[PDB]
């Protein structure tokens, strides 16, 4: 049966991608400090297979951890475009989510989703390190639900 095979192959690639999520070493403001605390020993994001890598060419996730200003917006879009696919964006904190405390500023982008597509929105100012980890595990369960091969089979 073709369906059974592509169903199992979807599980394999979905498992491999969520089990090995490499965020780009990309932080913007206060929220990056809680992101640092997710890598710290108490939460040890490495133990889920989550490893920071500096190069966008070697990153699977962009965690927008902090305010995105207008001056920074073209750079964030640049490094997002330079990530190979599949790629995911996690929006962390009120600033990234929708402008937050600086929503009405002349120099702030009112939400990073004006610039890049966003898979998960982590609320808080900042979200606790555990709240960000909950957001990453939520991203994993989203990847687990993907049906690329199943949809390809029925094209």
């Amino acid at each position: 049966r073709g369906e059974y095979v592509v169903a199992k192959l979807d599980d394999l690639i979905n498992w491999a991608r969520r089990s090995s999520l490499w965020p780009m070493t990309f932080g913007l403001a206060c929220c990056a400090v809680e992101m640092m605390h997710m890598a710290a020993p108490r939460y040890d994001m490495d133990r889920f297979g989550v490893v920071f890598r500096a190069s966008p060419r070697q990153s699977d996730v962009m965690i927008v951890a902090g305010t995105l200003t207008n001056k920074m917006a073209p750079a964030l879009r640049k490094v997002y475009d330079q990530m190979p696919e599949p790629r995911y964006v996690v929006s962390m904190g009120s600033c990234a989510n929708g402008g937050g405390y600086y929503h009405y500023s002349y120099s702030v982008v009112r939400g990073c989703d004006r610039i890049v597509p966003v898979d998960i929105y982590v609320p808080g100012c900042p979200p606790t390190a555990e709240a960000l980890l909950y957001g990453i595990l939520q991203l994993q369960k989203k990847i687990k639900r993907e049906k690329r091969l199943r949809i390809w089979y029925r094209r």
């Binding site: 989703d113 898979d119 993907e146 049906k147 029925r154 094209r155």
Partner: protein
């Protein structure tokens, strides 16, 4: 007008354009520009999609919060069509495929599916209906793609008499399968052209021109019940167009004539791919079909769109096809192709 659809604002992202549009086939080449233009002015857009939600992510930034709504649908299921259209004021059909698959053939995507969308839209009270046909649609065509475009075009008009039907020539743009198609031939050495491209004339049209024409059709009360032909401003011999493509890309051009029957055999070879075929017999036919001249139909000028010359936009498409040595060459470094007068 219901009070929720009275236009407000200054026509920006956070405005209210009053358009509530269901766009079928929004996840393709043409759809991304149509959804972008609707979202620019604060329209409500319903994007029914068959694909993986990952492949709709590029659409999400195009609208203010709540202005892009995604739905699952199946071209064979009429309920899924009804749910996606019963709140809309205009329905736009951009469903199409350049190859047949095991599950959907040209008849399914260019006749059965477009007819079902039109039928359900009429039953649901949808007021406007825009359907994309093809300039060269002809029942007497060697291309099954173009034969189905002719059958479905008649069906849509009969099912939804007030529909606006748009017939574009080949569309060129960043994500096209036209200029990118010719540029990608370089991977096989020389460029095979039937009769050396001297017996074909094309009149390609810019993607943004088609998009602006679609958007003005929605807002134009005179466009209801009409059939338009969206053509670019100049006609070229196929050989000249392909030579120009390779000049803009600064790639070596080796054209050699290939007979029609040999090209078809090559087309059948690439069709064996279970993915997106690089080329097909039908694709070879359409590329070598002369673009019809239809003076009796209204065109882009009748919707307030001035057609963009191919010379102003080819580099926007073809710069990525150059090597490092030639990446920075400017728009004025290549002379235009001979345009048929």
């Amino acid at each position: 007008l219901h009070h929720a659809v009275i236009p407000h604002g200054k026509g920006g992202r956070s405005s209210v354009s009053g358009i509530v549009a269901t766009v079928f086939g929004a996840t393709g080449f043409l759809g991304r520009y149509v959804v972008n233009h609707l979202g620019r002015m604060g329209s409500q857009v319903i994007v029914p999609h068959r694909c993986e939600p990952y492949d709709t992510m590029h659409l999400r930034p195009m609208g203010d919060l709540g202005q892009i709504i995604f739905m699952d649908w199946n071209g064979r299921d009429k309920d899924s069509i009804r749910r996606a259209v019963e709140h809309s004021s205009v329905v736009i059909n951009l469903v199409g495929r350049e190859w047949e698959t095991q599950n959907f053939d040209f008849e399914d995507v260019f006749v059965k599916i477009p007819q079902a969308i039109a039928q359900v839209s009429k039953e649901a009270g949808v007021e406007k209906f825009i359907h994309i046909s093809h300039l060269n649609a002809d029942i007497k065509s060697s291309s099954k793609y173009l034969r189905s475009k002719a059958v479905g075009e008649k069906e849509v008009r009969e099912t939804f008499p007030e529909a606006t039907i748009i017939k574009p020539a080949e569309i060129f743009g960043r994500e096209d399968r036209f200029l990118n198609y010719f540029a990608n031939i370089r991977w096989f050495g020389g460029v095979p052209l039937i009769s050396l491209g001297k017996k074909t004339v094309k009149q390609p049209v810019y993607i943004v021109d088609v998009t602006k024409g679609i958007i003005n059709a929605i807002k134009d009360p005179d466009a209801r019940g009409k059939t338009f032909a969206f053509v670019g401003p100049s006609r070229y011999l196929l050989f000249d167009l392909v030579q120009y493509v390779f000049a803009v890309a600064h790639r070596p051009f080796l054209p050699y004539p290939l007979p029609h029957f040999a090209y078809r055999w090559i087309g059948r070879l690439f069709e064996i791919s279970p993915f997106e075929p690089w080329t097909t017999r039908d694709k070879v036919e359409r590329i070598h079909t002369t673009d019809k001249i239809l003076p009796h139909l209204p065109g882009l000028e009748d919707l307030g769109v001035e057609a963009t010359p191919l010379e102003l936009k080819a580099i926007e498409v073809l710069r990525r096809h150059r090597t490092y040595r030639w990446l920075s060459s400017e728009i004025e470094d290549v002379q235009p192709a001979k345009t048929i007068p």
